[PDB]
Design a protein around this ligand. Structure first.
Ligand SMILES: CC[C@H](NC)C(=O)N[C@H](C(=O)N1C[C@H]2CCCN2C[C@H]1C(=O)N[C@@H]1CCOc2ccccc21)C1CCCCC1
Ligand SMILES: [Zn+2]
Length: 94
């Protein structure tokens, strides 16, 4: 109900969106899909199925989980998978 994109709540559905993911991008679909993200079909742009947070310009060593907590800390999917303690840790850096 509060989920932004219901058709993207499964990991499998999120993985299917990466068919046209440019292989030049250093961050892999598995890492993104695990962290709630699916590809929206432009550039390297992804969104979270739950909170609708959008991220782009992925560089090597970027951790989608950490980016999720940094920019979109009140996402329910993030809080339930990784825990509020994790979200507080990341927020405590920046
Ligand atoms: C994702 C990790 C990446 N590491 C270099 C990163 O930090 N990306 C930033 C990023 O993705 N951001 C930045 C933060 C600052 C305030 C909120 N922003 C969220 C995110 C972003 O720019 N998202 C855009 C906003 C417009 O809507 C969409 C839609 C889909 C995908 C991305 C976005 C930003 C970096 C500078 C160049 C543009 C991208
Ligand atoms: Zn989210």
């Amino acid at each position: 109900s509060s989920i932004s994109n219901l058709s993207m709540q499964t990991h499998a559905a999120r993985m299917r969106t990466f068919m046209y993911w440019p292989s030049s991008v250093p961050v892999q679909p598995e890492q993104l899909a695990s962290a709630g993200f699916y590809y929206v079909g432009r550039n390297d742009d992804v969104k979270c199925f739950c909170c609708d947070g959008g991220l782009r310009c992925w560089e090597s060593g970027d951790d989608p989980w950490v980016e999720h907590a940094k920019w979109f800390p009140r996402c329910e999917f993030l809080i339930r998978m990784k825990g509020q303690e994790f979200v507080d840790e990341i927020q405590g850096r920046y």
